[PDB]
Structures are given as structure tokens and as C-alpha cells.
Symmetry: C6
Subunit: 134 residues, 6 copies
């Protein structure tokens, strides 16, 4: 699995996330207008966070952040939260990522994640189709 | 395999079921209006139970509970029962789940289940197509 | 592989068949009007026999018994026989199942079966298409 | 891989062929009008010979003998021969099967066969399409 | 992978090529008008050479020599050469096959071949599409 | 995976790139007008560089350099750079390839590459679709 990022403006930032028990931020790369980034989901990276006006293009389709197994989340309005639920005998929220308007999160189901919870006004995409919370 | 749950109202409840010889209830998660839950079928979870007005979306299609290998069951009217039949030399009902109107059950065929029996007025979906008991 | 059975009347009976050298009957389950049965082909079960007015639905399509690798046989008229031919150096009929009108038999090719013989007026379905003896 | 045989007349005969170095005839089964035979290609059987008015139905399509990796040969006129060429360092004809008008031969590529030669007026079918010698 | 050869004239010749470090000619078979040859690519044979008026039919499509991973080469005019480039740390031409008008070469990428070079007026076919040098 | 190169002019040059920690140039082959080159991505070669008027044809489609998992880059204007980002715990640019106008680079994601960065005016193609930086 892999995705594409194109920047419609300067300052677009792409964050990496660590795979495993610990969910922390992997140092980021900056994209200027016209620059393109193509990346895969690897052993060390299982999720990413995209901030700024950008074109995100994946196997499911194309997304425009400026306009109003793995899955995609887009924030229609500040206050969106994504919870990761632990795989195994116990179910608990081991990570809570906050998404601001225009931010996009791409994540996979991992050894430590088998379920997630999304809150607030957001756009969600999946292999089967797209879903709107509002 | 994975599914999607969206809540059209507050109080929507999603139950997990234990995989193995014992069929009991796995502690549940609550969803408010606009919240979304994406989950997989795992080693410890092989079936789920959904209660309340919700949009259930799977590989086979989309279901609306409010309106009138794995499979889906929806209850058109109280009194629906789902029996699990034991895999192996002997065939017996090792579990009997009751479904009320609007409740949806998503289950897989497991090491301990190779056949099920559905009773009453219900809507059933499968990879091959949809089926109505009435 | 799995199939679906729905009953259009009371008294519908579904028989299981033992996989292996011995071909005998596995104790049956009864279905009333509106009841649905979903079952797989397993290590111990490799064929089934369906009797009564029912809707049989499989990967190949849907069958109605009331109207006039694995395969399906339906009897248009009493006197239909299905012979199982032994896999290996020798070819002999190790089992002879009789089908009455409206009865449906679903069977797979197994370690002990690599060829079958059908006699009389019957309807046959396969992955490639449907066939009528008459 | 498997095929279907239906008889449009009495006396239809189906021959089996031995897989391995030796290519000889496996004792045959007889089909009367309306009888159907469904068989697979197995360790001991890798080719068959069909004689008489019959409907031969395979993954590639349906054939009518009466009218004017594996492959199919039909004889439009007596004198058709099928040669089997040895797999390995040497290429020689280790078997020569003669086909009369209306006879159909279904064969696979085996450990001992990697090429065949067809002579005379015949109809040939393959996964990619059909071919006529005349 | 396998191909089909049909002869539109007498004297059609099919050559085999040895797989491995050494690229030499494998003794040939002759085809008369109406004769058909079906062959596979094997451990010992990885390429073939076809000479004369013939119908060559493959997974990609059908070719007519008389008219004006694996690949196909056809010569529109004498002087066509096909070079085989060595797989590994070094790149060198270990074989140079000459093709006359109407001759067709079918070859695979092997342990010793990972790249080829074609010169002159020729027609080339591949899984993705057809290509003309002129 | 494999690609096709055809030359619309003399002097077209194709460069190979070494797979592994070290990213250096593999000695090149020259193509004259009408010549065709078909090559695979191998253990020792994971990327190529194409210079001159040529037709590049791949699984995704056909490209014309003269006109204005693996991916393709084309330069609309001098100054295009492609950075390779290291797979593993650390992210750094271990190689920076410069592309002039009309030059085309075809590269795969390898054990040492899991992400790339493209700068300037360029055309990018991927399995999912095409992308333009301008
Ligand atoms: N470390 C987590 C990262 C992760 C995966 N999916 C997520 C969903 C939400 C938040 C974090 C995650 C994991 O590999 O499982
Ligand atoms: N720990 C649970 C998480 C889970 C999976 N599916 C669920 C459905 C509902 C609630 C929790 C879950 C498991 O891996 O099985
Ligand atoms: N513990 C059971 C759960 C189950 C699977 N399918 C079912 C159908 C009905 C009721 C329970 C189940 C199992 O893993 O087999
Ligand atoms: N114990 C049986 C259950 C079963 C499978 N298929 C059936 C069909 C009908 C009745 C029972 C069954 C088995 O695993 O084989
Ligand atoms: N015991 C038999 C059952 C069977 C399979 N296919 C059949 C066809 C006809 C009659 C019986 C069978 C077997 O496993 O091989
Ligand atoms: N015992 C034979 C059965 C068989 C296979 N294909 C056939 C075709 C015709 C008659 C018998 C057969 C075998 O396994 O090879
Ligand atoms: N014994 C031969 C049978 C055979 C296969 N393909 C054939 C084609 C023609 C004649 C015989 C055959 C084999 O297994 O190889
Ligand atoms: N003995 C040869 C047979 C063969 C394969 N492909 C061919 C093409 C032409 C002639 C003979 C052959 C081999 O296995 O390689
Ligand atoms: N002996 C060579 C034969 C070959 C394969 N592809 C070719 C292309 C051109 C010429 C010869 C070949 C090999 O197996 O690799
Ligand atoms: N020896 C080289 C051959 C090669 C592959 N791809 C190429 C592209 C261009 C030139 C040569 C090559 C290799 O196996 O890697
Ligand atoms: N040696 C590098 C070559 C490479 C792959 N992808 C690239 C992208 C850009 C530049 C170089 C590369 C590798 O195998 O990983
Ligand atoms: N070293 C990182 C590279 C990487 C993968 N995906 C990314 C997304 C953004 C930034 C860097 C990355 C890894 O293999 O996981």
C-alpha cells in the first residue's frame, strides 16, 4: 500500500507515525508548491498526518483537503478526534489523535490496532465506499 | 474482513463476541450521533451485535437499521433467534442469540461454527446476495 | 464454499453426508416456514440432501425446488440416481443416492470421489453453466 | 479442472487414459440417453476419449459432437491423429492417438507431455480461443 | 505459458531453443498444411523460432506471418536482429538471433536473460500492447 | 515488472541504477531510430534513466518524451530533482537524481527506499493515475 501527496501551497507538512505499542510522531518532511511525495506504509511507519492545502491520492480515489486494510479521515471542522482501540483480550484507547480542519490522517490496522473510533464532523473513505458523519 | 458503523442517534451500542468454545459478550462501546466506528474480525472477536439507529456498511453493501466467510442478520420484528451449530462429528446448538427489532448481528464461520439456523422475520445478506425470510 | 437454504413450507429436511470412505447419512435438521439455514462444506460434511419446498441459493445462482469444485442436482421426476465413482487406480460405484422429485443434492469432489454418474430426468448446475438431461 | 458429458444417444462411451510414462486405455463407462457424467483430471487420469453423439461442456464453452493447462480436439473427418511429444532434453512421439469422426479428446499437459501435434481435419479449442484446421 | 502454431503451407518449421547459459538450437518439427502444434515453455525450452506461412496464436492475440513474462517478435523485412543481454552485475550480448521476413520468435525472460535489444523493421507484441518499429 | 523503450531518434541512451545501499550508474546501452529495448527490474537493477526522443510504454500506459510497486517521472522543464528517502528508523536523502527536460526516470520502492520527494515541473504516473505538478 502507498499514497501520493501534492502541495497546492507552501508549508504543507507530512508527519509519520511509529508502528508498535508506542504511538508517537516521526519527524516530518516539508513540501512546497508543486512538490510531490510518494510514500509507502512500512514496518516503522503505519500512519501519516497531512496538514495544509494538498491533493491526497490513494487506491480508493482522490481527495482535496482545501474543499469542504487502511482507511482515510478528513476533518470538515476543528474538534475531530481519532481513537485507537487495542487488539487482544482488552479494549482500551491507547492513542487519541486530534485533527484540525483540512488535516487528513491515513492509517492502517496493525498488530496493536483492530478498531478505531471517530468523533465530530469528518469525511471518511474506505475500500467499500465513502462516509460522511454529518 | 472489516465493517463500518455510523450512528444516526445517541446511545447506539456495539457488542463484541468471544471466539472459541465459549460464546459470551465482550464489553461494549457507545456511539453518539455522528460518531463512526471501524473494526475488524480478529482472533478474539468473531461476531458483533449492533443496537440502535445506525448505518452498517460492509463489503456486501450498506444497511439501514431504522428502515424496515461472514454473513449479516437484521431483525424485521422481535423474536428473531440465531443458533450456532457445532463443527465436527456432532451437530448441536451451542449458542442461541436473540435479536430485537432493529438489531443487527454480523458473524463469521469459525473453527467452532460451520452452520447456523435463523428463525422468524429477518433480513439476511451474504456474498452471493440478499435474502428475506418473510 | 457454502450454501443457503430457506423453507417455503414446514417439514423441510436437510441431511448431511459423511466425508471419507464411508458414505452414510449425518443426522438432519428441520426447517419451518421462514426459517433459514446457512452451512459450509467441512472436513466431516462434503454433501447434503434437501427435501421439500425450499429456496436453495449458491455461488452459481438461485434454485426453486417447487418449480419444474462442487455441483448441484435437482430431480424433475422420481427415479433419479447419483453414483459416486472411486478416485484412484480403480473405478467403481461406492455409493448410489436416490433422489425423489423436488429433492436437491449438493456435493463436492473429494479425496474418494473424482467422478459421478447421473441418471434420469434431472437438472444439473455447475460453475460453467446449467444442464438439463431431458 | 473438470468437464461434463451428456449423451444424446445410447452407447456413448468415455475412455480414461493413464498419466505417466505409459499411455494406455483406462476401462470405460457407458452412458445412455439422458445420462450425465461429471469427472475431473486426477493423478491417474490425465486425458479422456469420448465417442458418440454427446454434449461436451467445459470451462472454455460447450461442444456438440454430432454437428460438423488443457485443450480439446474434435474430428471433422476420419484420419485425425494426435501425437504426444516428450518433455525434457529429447523430443519424440511417445503416443499416437487416432480420432474418428465425432470423437472428442480432452487432454492436459503433464510431466511427460509438453507439446502435441495434430493432423488432418479437426476442431481445436483452447483457453485463448477456438481454431479450425480446414 | 503456451502458444499455438497452425500451418497455412507445407514446410513450416518450428525450432526450439535451449534454456541456460548456452543458447543453441533444439531439433525442429515440421508442419504440413492444416497441421497444428501446441507447445509450452519448459525447463529445457525457453524460446522458439517459427518459419513459413503460419497462424501464431498466444495469450496476447493472434498473428499472421504472411501479412505485412514473454514477448513476440515478427520481421517485416530481412535484417532483424534480437540480442540477449545477460542478467547480473554485467551486461553483455551473449546471443544474437537473426530473423528473416515472415519469421517469428517467441521468447521469455529467464535466469540468464533480463533484457533484450531489437533492431530493424519488426513487429513486437507484449502483454501491455503491440509496438511497431517503423 | 518490465517496460519498453523505442527510439524516435538516434543517440537515445538508457542508464541502469544499482539496487542496494549504494545508488550509482550502471553502464548504459544506446538505441538508434527504430530500435527497441525490453528490460525488467532485477536484483541488481531497480531504476533506469531514459534520455532522448523515445516512446516509453509500461503497465500504466504509454509516454512520449518529446511532447510537453513502481512509479514514473518525466521532466517538463530543466531543474527537476528526485530524492530517495531511507527506509527504517531514520529518514534521510541518500540520493539526489537530477532530470533534464525530456528525461524519464522509472524507479521502484526497494529495501532501501520507501519514500521519494519530487521537485519542480514534472509529470508523474502511478498505478492509480497520473499527476502533474504544475
Ligand atoms: N502505533 C500504532 C499506530 C496506529 C495505527 N492505527 C492507528 C489509528 C489511530 C491512531 C494510531 C494508529 C499501531 O501501529 O497500531
Ligand atoms: N480487542 C478486540 C477489539 C475489537 C475487535 N472487534 C471489535 C468490535 C467491537 C469492539 C471491540 C472490537 C479484539 O481484537 O477482538
Ligand atoms: N464463539 C463463537 C462465536 C460465533 C461465531 N459464529 C456465530 C454464530 C452465531 C452465534 C455465535 C457465533 C465462534 O467463534 O464460533
Ligand atoms: N458438524 C457438521 C456441521 C455441518 C456442516 N454442514 C452441514 C450441513 C447440514 C447439517 C450440518 C452440517 C460438520 O462440520 O460437518
Ligand atoms: N463420502 C463421500 C461423499 C460424496 C462426495 N461426493 C459424492 C457424490 C455422490 C455421492 C456421495 C458423495 C466423499 O467424501 O467422497
Ligand atoms: N479412478 C479414476 C476416475 C476417473 C477420473 N477421470 C475419469 C474419466 C472417466 C472415467 C473415470 C475417471 C481416476 O481417478 O483417475
Ligand atoms: N500418459 C500421458 C497422457 C497424455 C497427456 N497428454 C496427452 C496428449 C496426447 C496423448 C496422450 C497424452 C501423460 O500423462 O503425459
Ligand atoms: N522436450 C522439449 C519439448 C518442447 C517444448 N517446447 C517445444 C517447442 C518446439 C518443439 C519442442 C518443444 C522440452 O521440454 O523443452
Ligand atoms: N538460453 C537463453 C535463451 C533465451 C531467452 N530469451 C532470449 C532472448 C533472445 C535470445 C535468446 C534467449 C535463456 O534461457 O536465457
Ligand atoms: N544485468 C542487468 C541487466 C539489466 C536489467 N535492467 C536493465 C536496464 C537497462 C540496462 C540493463 C539492464 C540486471 O540484471 O540488472
Ligand atoms: N539503490 C536504490 C535505487 C533507487 C530505488 N528507488 C529510487 C528512487 C530514487 C533514487 C534512487 C532509487 C535502491 O535500490 O533503493
Ligand atoms: N523511514 C521511514 C520512511 C517513511 C515511510 N513512510 C513515510 C511517511 C512520511 C515520512 C517518512 C516515511 C519508514 O520506513 O517508515
Amino acid at each position: 500500500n502507498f499514497f501520493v501527496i501534492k502541495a497546492k501551497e507552501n508549508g504543507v507538512n507530512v508527519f509519520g507515525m511509529t508502528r508498535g505499542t508506542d504511538t508517537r510522531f516521526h519527524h516530518s518532511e516539508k513540501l512546497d508548491k508543486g512538490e510531490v511525495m510518494i510514500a509507502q506504509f512500512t514496518e516503522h511507519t503505519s500512519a501519516v498526518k497531512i496538514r495544509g492545502k494538498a491533493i491526497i491520492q490513494t487506491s480508493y480515489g482522490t481527495l482535496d483537503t482545501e474543499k469542504d486494510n487502511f482507511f482515510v479521515i478528513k476533518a470538515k471542522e476543528n474538534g475531530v478526534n481519532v481513537f485507537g482501540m487495542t487488539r487482544g483480550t482488552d479494549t482500551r484507547f491507547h492513542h487519541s489523535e486530534k485533527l484540525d480542519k483540512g488535516e487528513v490522517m491515513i492509517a492502517q490496522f496493525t498488530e496493536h490496532t483492530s478498531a478505531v473510533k471517530i468523533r465530530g464532523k469528518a469525511i471518511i473513505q474506505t475500500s467499500y465506499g465513502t462516509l460522511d458523519t454529518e
